[PDB]
Structure formats: structure tokens, C-alpha cells
């Protein structure tokens with residue numbers, strides 16, 4: 001509905017603030033499921 | 036001590052904000068943690 005709305009390879013604002021949570025979580029499950 | 040207060044669950048969006056990737060995980064863990 002809004003005019004002038006722009007586009008790029010814009011990441012969601014949701015993930016970069018919570019990178020230290022979800023990225024560490026995914027890395028921990030990947031390390032646990034690797035062997 | 037507050038007067039005129041009614042009973043209902045609290046309402047302002049922080050729970051779906053940071054737990055966007057976790058509320059679905061909470062629903063999945065409802066069959067794991069609770070029983």
C-alpha cells in the first residue's frame with residue numbers, strides 16, 4: 001500500500017539483533033548432530 | 036494495591052518479537068517439555 005517503498009538484498013531486521021542467539025543455537029545443534 | 040484493575044493476560048508485542056523463531060519451537064517443545 002505504501003508508495004516509494006524500496007528493495008535491495010535487505011535482510012529482515014529480525015535476525016541480526018538475535019544473531020548471537022539463533023546462530024549459536026544452530027551451530028550447537030549442528031555440532032551435536034555431527035557425530 | 037492498584038484500584039480498578041481487571042484480570043486478563045498482558046498485551047503488548049515483545050513475546051512474538053524476539054521469540055519469532057522460538058514460539059514455533061515452544062509449540063514443538065509443548066509435546067516434549069510438558070509431558
Ligand SMILES: *[C@@H]1O[C@H](CO)[C@@H](O[C@@H]2O[C@H](CO)[C@@H](O[C@@H]3O[C@H](CO)[C@@H](O)[C@H](O)[C@@H]3O)[C@H](O)[C@H]2NC(C)=O)[C@H](O)[C@H]1NC(C)=O
Pocket residue numbers: 006007
Ligand atoms: C520488493 O520486494 C518484494 C520481495 O522480494 C517483492 O515481492 C514480490 O512480489 C512479486 C509479485 O507480487 C512476486 O512474484 C514476482 O513477480 C515479478 C513480476 O512477475 C517477477 O519479476 C519476480 O521474479 C517474481 O516472480 C515475488 O514472489 C515477491 N517476492 C517474494 C520474495 O515473495 C515486491 O514486488 C518488490 N517490489 C518492487 C517494487 O520491486
Ligand SMILES: *[C@@H]1O[C@H](CO)[C@@H](O[C@@H]2O[C@H](CO)[C@@H](O[C@@H]3O[C@H](CO)[C@@H](O)[C@H](O)[C@@H]3O)[C@H](O)[C@H]2NC(C)=O)[C@H](O)[C@H]1NC(C)=O
Pocket residue numbers: 041042
Ligand atoms: C483475577 O485475579 C483475582 C485475584 O487473584 C481474582 O480474584 C479472586 O478473589 C479474591 C481477590 O479478589 C481472591 O482471594 C484471595 O486470593 C489469594 C490468592 O491470591 C488467596 O490466598 C485467598 O483465597 C484470598 O482470599 C481469590 O482467590 C481470587 N480468585 C482466584 C481464582 O484467584 C479474580 O477472580 C481473577 N479473575 C479471573 C477471571 O480469573
Ligand SMILES: *[C@@H]1O[C@H](CO)[C@@H](O)[C@H](O)[C@H]1NC(C)=O
Pocket residue numbers: 039
Ligand atoms: C464508579 O462509580 C459508581 C458510583 O456509585 C460506583 O458504584 C462504582 O463502584 C465506581 N467504579 C469503581 C471501579 O469503583
